[model samples]
Target: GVPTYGAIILDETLENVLLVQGYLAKSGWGFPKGKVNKEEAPHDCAAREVFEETGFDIKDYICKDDYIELRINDQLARLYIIPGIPKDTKFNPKTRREIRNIEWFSIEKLPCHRNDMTPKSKLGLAPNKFFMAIPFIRPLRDWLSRRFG
Candidate 1:
């Protein structure tokens, strides 16, 4: 069986809410994550998956050295960690990518307890997120999309 990847990309924002996006996953939201390639750095793989799906050129977008995991019964995933990916970059996804559209939501709204969450919660690693880093995104998103409104 093939396990799915949950990608975690973000836009530096002026809101303490760590901006989250909708993805082609069960929760209908998450960051950029996917299968690891042979000998490929998981960090690089996470960054590459972002571009392949949304077309963001992650030349400098830093990937968190730490990681998280989402579980579905016996299934589990050591997902990649991305600090903050800006929204200013243009989206140029390759043909036939499996995604709908991306939307921004606040991460402050994550499930408080792993045992208290719903099925959707099982699809995310909210319990493992860097809560301390979540607050810095407010001004960061503002800086990234400075090109337009």
Candidate 2:
């Protein structure tokens, strides 16, 4: 089977999420995400990709790998949690990443329906999301299982 991977979700303060504005390769708003290259750790790449696509504040900002993954292929993902200020934030795109027109999505209601994220639901946040989440989840499950056992 072909390999899969998860993507870096650009969260502005663990609440509002950053999405591409009125553009993609075509249109619509969505998070910036990509594949983890060979021999690269997903956790590290997740952070690096976020910094590359979103342009960190001073390389400032703060976050943790406080997230789980939803697998896509045989590979596993490590979601690096990033928190930031939504409105006044700035971002840039590099030729490699091909990101453009980033914006924060702050909606009381879905301006367009189905534009939502499930709590740990897997999609194409890149690709191998499910595979990645398992490794991330294993320790959490073990910790809970041992605690509850």
Candidate 3:
């Protein structure tokens, strides 16, 4: 059976997105995520995992039904998004042993290359470049456009 996991593509500001350096990050930086509990809703699991792993209260953040899935490394992952995370909310990873750092990265500041994209890899070793790809990123851009514009 495939293990289920959930993640949040959180916004730190209107233009900035959040990423974390943690043990599970194949690359050093990525969204906060965790395994889904038995019978727990995917989005609910996303919010809970954020709080447990990053100590961010994402419950109040605006989370729509929007989501994307990835089939990588024998894992079927469910990735959710929180359009605009409250900027004032503080970051405190409760699992200090698992998480190393949390940062808000300007979406525009991310690197785009034909063969090499993932800026997260520059920060550390990341096995997947999902966010670095255009197709995966376009949906978030579209959502932001619809939400803020």
Candidate 4:
């Protein structure tokens, strides 16, 4: 059987969302995610992966029935959207392992290229990063919109 992975949206608000900068990716930012082990439930796997990738664990996070699926690196990836943790909560990814940094950014300004990051990091934000993220942006915003409506 093909392997399954779990991903979290970590939506803090309609505008603000959490993204992690992974060390292994040569510096790319995205949701906290990992492969789900066969022994655990998917949601629990999602929570555990998110916790392992980002220091902050999900607590009473709102999960929707809808999910975003895609083939990444010829592998199946299923991203489960969770409408969030405290906006003020901080995160510190297990450095030297999964990520180098984590930060919340305005969805309105999903960085594609910037002076603030290393050149290699900037490369991670363009083309590929934007491509993977585009599908989720509006759907996630729309889903959360009704909640605040």
Candidate lDDT scores, in order, read 0.47, 0.45, 0.63, 0.63
Off by over 4 Å in 3: 1-13, 24-27, 62-64, 112-136, 146-149
The digit string of per-residue lDDT tens for model 2 on 28-103 reads 4444445677886555566566666666532233344354454546544444434445556556755333654676
Ranking by TM-score: 3, 4, 2, 1
What tens digits encode model 1's per-residue C-alpha lDDT throughout 1-149? 23434344555662222223333342344444456677776567666766666666453655454445545455554444444555454555542346555455554455333343466755544443333223233333443346235
Model 3: weakest 10-residue lDDT segment is 126-135
TM-score for each of the candidates: 0.51, 0.51, 0.69, 0.68
What does candidate 3's lDDT look like per residue over 1-149, in tens digits? 35444455555566877777775544466667777778887677777888877787666653546666666577666666666666666889888888777787676765432344355455443345434332335556666688678
Better of 2 and 4 by TM-score: 4
Q: Which stretches of candidate 2 lie over 4 Å from their true place?
A: 1-15, 21-26, 57-64, 73-78, 111-149
Models ranked on lDDT: 3, 4, 1, 2
Better lDDT candidate (1, 2): 1
Model 4 clashes, total count = 0
Residue 117 in candidate 1, Cα distance off native in Å = 12
The true-versus-predicted C-alpha distance at residue 103 of model 2, in Å, is 0.3
> Model 2 shows how many backbone clashes?
16
Off by over 4 Å in 1: 1-7, 14-27, 70-76, 109-149
